[PDB]
Amino acid sequence: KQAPGVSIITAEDIAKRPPSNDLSQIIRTMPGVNLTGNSSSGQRGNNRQIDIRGMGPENTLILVDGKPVSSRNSVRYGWRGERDSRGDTNWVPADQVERIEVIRGPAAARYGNGAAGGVVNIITKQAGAETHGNLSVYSNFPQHKAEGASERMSFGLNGPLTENLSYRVYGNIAKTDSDDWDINAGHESNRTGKQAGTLPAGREGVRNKDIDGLLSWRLTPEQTLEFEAGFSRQGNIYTGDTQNTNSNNYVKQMLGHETNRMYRETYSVTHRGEWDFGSSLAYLQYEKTRNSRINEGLAGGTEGIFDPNNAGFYTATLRDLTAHGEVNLPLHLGYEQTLTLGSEWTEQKLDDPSSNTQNTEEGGSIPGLAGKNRSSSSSARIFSLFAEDNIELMPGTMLTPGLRWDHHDIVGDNWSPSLNLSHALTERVTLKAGIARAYKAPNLYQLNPDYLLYSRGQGCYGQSTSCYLRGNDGLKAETSVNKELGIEYSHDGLVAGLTYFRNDYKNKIESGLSPVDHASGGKGDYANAAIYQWENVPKAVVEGLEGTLTLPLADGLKWSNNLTYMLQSKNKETGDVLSVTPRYTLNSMLDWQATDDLSLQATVTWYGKQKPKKYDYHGDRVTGSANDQLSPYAIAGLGGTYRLSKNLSLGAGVDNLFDKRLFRAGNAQGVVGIDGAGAATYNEPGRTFYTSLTASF
Ligand SMILES: O=C(NCCCCNC(=O)[C@H](CCCCNC(=O)c1cccc(O)c1O)NC(=O)c1cccc(O)c1O)c1cccc(O)c1O
Ligand SMILES: [Fe+3]
């Protein structure tokens, strides 16, 4: 379940540490993985997503059965690098997952665009030779009522209909209540003036509806043809969250209301063929995401708060089209080896009405940008060709080179080579090394010169004068040279391993630091504002350690541990951190199979210290509560699963047994009337009992 670079989570693991609702909860406990924001602002800080090796969650590519999820790219990408999005790990329900694969660093680059951190691939349970199904229910109960409880019901149902014809379907209904609007009261950062009384929000709630159907059709013994369609819906429950933690009356009106809904529809055709020379796979996916939410402002403090002048919903639409071909070729030659050949094509169409609406009446107008009625539409296509060769130099030693070439229709050509070595120093010991250069295509917001934010001063780098920030079709893609060197002892369920990783991070895209221009005209002190773009930041670095250790204490009894230690995370231009992660993270499970029918689990997670950014949006050094750090802390849990028959199991447990709690105080830095909160940007939920029930044939 842990090799160097790679982790599997199984369906059995999902049962022994049941997630509330989102899978991020269990995915984040792998080595190398954190749950964090994309950037340092702390904005939308209770909306944290899976991060691989400190590279940010935009560089974690989420797959379902090998097919991209791109839905979050429908949510506005803000000045400071965040989206008001819960991410893309909540589309498949926990209890219909067969396994999750997490692939980190150099072994992930070959997957291409947006895998600089790595790939997380959520794999669903499939039909068997007979009809099976299941019914899974989960329900939790926080000690403190402020905190939102979660409820989850999902079925699955699968089998043959003819000898050439099979199916699987599932459907899920779930709800995570929001935190009370006031859960952070008395923990909030200092707030004066007109910002007096405002609150850093707790966790947003979500309602889920997921329905998938799959038909697998065996055209020949060697040819399989699959069709599936997916329908999901998430609607939130709002609890006061605003980009800057300021409030108005529209915010309060909606408290408890659904203010955003994502409908996600996937249709896919997949043909899979296994024959003399080897294997073929090819697929078409159409993902259509509709992101309906309340119109928000786009200027300064008003960025990311509901806009009262223009009340009501807009709908942003993402149409994402993915097609993929491979075959593979066993090749007997100088070295016995295996070769893989493939193209990939994608199209991202984005229609977003609210995002390109900022006007130029106050900061003065911008040559080449119309102040009104700018386009909704943005798009990019990448075409890609690749080949991997997997090579047995001598038994138990493997070499895997591959080349990916990608043509982005705007950005141009990218070349992402890779090379992955494993060696058995001993029948017990294995050394692994990898060095790849991964690829990140600028997202459609960064790329678009119709996308325009404005600030009167407070958000402008290197000045207090008003400024604009503008998209930039000139940009280069972000690339990263992800190096990793690791060693693992592995014998009779004793596993002990330690990996060092460094990713050299080139052209990270980010709000720029110097004006490229100045507008002309507009009003008063704010006239002739500065113009900044999205830049490529020349160099950044992340660096750290991953470890695993697994000891069989006796037959009934297994002690497992995963360790992340983050050495460095540095924008080498500004010297500030890229993300806020914990210095280290240790997850420890004890697994007692107390009887053939009772399993018991104890867990602990230790989080290290967390430090905020050094510099504000001006580039100046922060002060007061902006500096505040989060001390190390641990979260422990007990649970069990009691099997009542082959057809019926029960679970129960406690998460956060000693009620260690944390509270979102605000964003990192201070603005006028709103003191910063440093690293205290999220809510850690308290003691929480849970129960569960799984019936299956
Ligand atoms: O005095 C300023 N703005 C006008 C005061 C009335 C606005 N008061 C508000 O409560 C609201 C919300 C203020 C909440 C605190 N501000 C922030 O957290 C903030 C964050 C990032 C960037 C900013 O410019 C911010 O103000 N501001 C606006 O209506 C506003 C409109 C257009 C352009 C802006 O930059 C805005 O902030 C000002 C002066 C220098 C620098 C600024 O960023 C200012 O907003
Ligand atoms: Fe402002």
Residue bearing the CA closest to ligand 1, atom 9: 301
Distance from C-alpha of 120 to C-alpha of 85, rounded to nearest angstrom: 18
- For the chain, breaks with the C atom over 2.5 A from the next N come after none
Structure tokens at 80: 């400071």
How far is residue 619's CA from residue 149's CA, in Å, rounded to a whole number?
A: 40
Rounded distance from Cα 466 to ligand 2 centre (Å): 9
- Residue 646 makes CB contacts below 8 A (sequence gap 6+) with none
- Give the span between the Cα atoms of 589 and 636, in whole angstroms: 10
Atom number, ligand 1, closest to the C-alpha of residue 244: 18
Please classify residue 321 by burial: count the beta carbons closer than 10 Å to its beta carbon, then call 0-12 exposed, 13-18 middle and 19+ buried. middle
Whether 676 is in the pocket of ligand 1, judged by its Cβ within 6 Å, is no
The residue to which tokens 């699968």 are assigned = 158
| CA torsion, ordered 486, 491, 495, 497, to nearest 10 deg | -10
Measured in Å, residue 125 CA sits from the centre of ligand 2 at: 50
Q: Is the CB of 191 under 6 A from ligand 1?
A: no
Which protein residues have a CB closer than 5 Å to ligand 2 (ion)? 300-301, 456, 458
* Residue 121 Cβ contacting ligand 1 at under 6 Å: no
Q: Which ligand is nearest to the CA of 305?
A: 1
Among candidate residues 454, 389, 442, the one with its CA nearest the CA of residue 420:
389
Give CA torsion, residues 636, 664, 454, 79, to 10 deg.
-10
Give distance in angstroms: CA of 461 to centre of ligand 1.
Answer: 15
Mutate to test the pocket of ligand 1, among 303, 455, 461, 622 (most ligand atoms within 8 A of CB): 455
Write down the experimental method used for this entry: X-ray
Nearest to 317 by CA among 251, 262, 258, 393: 262
For the domain spanning 1-696, the CATH number is 2.40.170.20
Instruction: Report phi then psi at 71, rounded to 5.
Output: -55, -40
Q: What is the DSSP string of 610-647?
A: B---SB-TTSPBP-GGGG--BPPEEEEEEEEEEEEETT
How far is the centre of ligand 1, averaged over its atoms, from the C-alpha of 39 (Å)?
A: 21
678 strand-pairing partners: none
Q: How far is the CA of 349 from the centre of ligand 1 (A)?
A: 33
Cβ contact 176:86 at 8 Å: no
DSSP string for residues in 461-529: TT-SS-EEEE--TTPPPEEEEEEEEEEEEEETTEEEEEEEEEEEEEEEEEE-SS-SEE-B--SGGGSS-
Whole-number Å distance, alpha carbon 380 to ligand 1 midpoint, is: 34
What is the three-state SS of 369-416? ECCCCCCCEEEEEEEEEEEEEEEEEECCEEEEEEEEEEEECCCEEEEE
Judge whether 239 and 176 are in contact, CB under 8 Å.
Answer: no
Q: How far apart are the C-alpha atoms of 569 and 125, rounded to whole Å?
A: 37
Domain boundaries in the chain? 1-696
| DSSP 8-state secondary structure symbol assigned to residue 148 | P
Q: Determine the atom of ligand 1 nearest the C-alpha atom of 672.
A: 15
| CA–CA gap between residue 220 and residue 149 (Å, rounded) | 49
Paired strand residues for 559: 551, 590
**CB-ligand 1 contact for 243 (6 Å cutoff):** no
Ligand nearest to the CA of 511: 1
Substitution candidate for ligand 1 out of 44, 243, 302, 305 with most atoms within 8 A of CB = 302
- The dihedral over CA atoms of 439, 441, 442, 443, expressed in degrees to the nearest 10, equals -120
Atom of ligand 1 nearest to the CA of 667: 18
Residue 456 Cβ < 6 Å to ligand 1: yes
| DSSP symbols for 560-607 | EEEEEEEEEEEETTT---SS---SEEEEEEEEE--SSSEEEEEEEEEE
CA gap 228, 230 in Å, rounded: 7
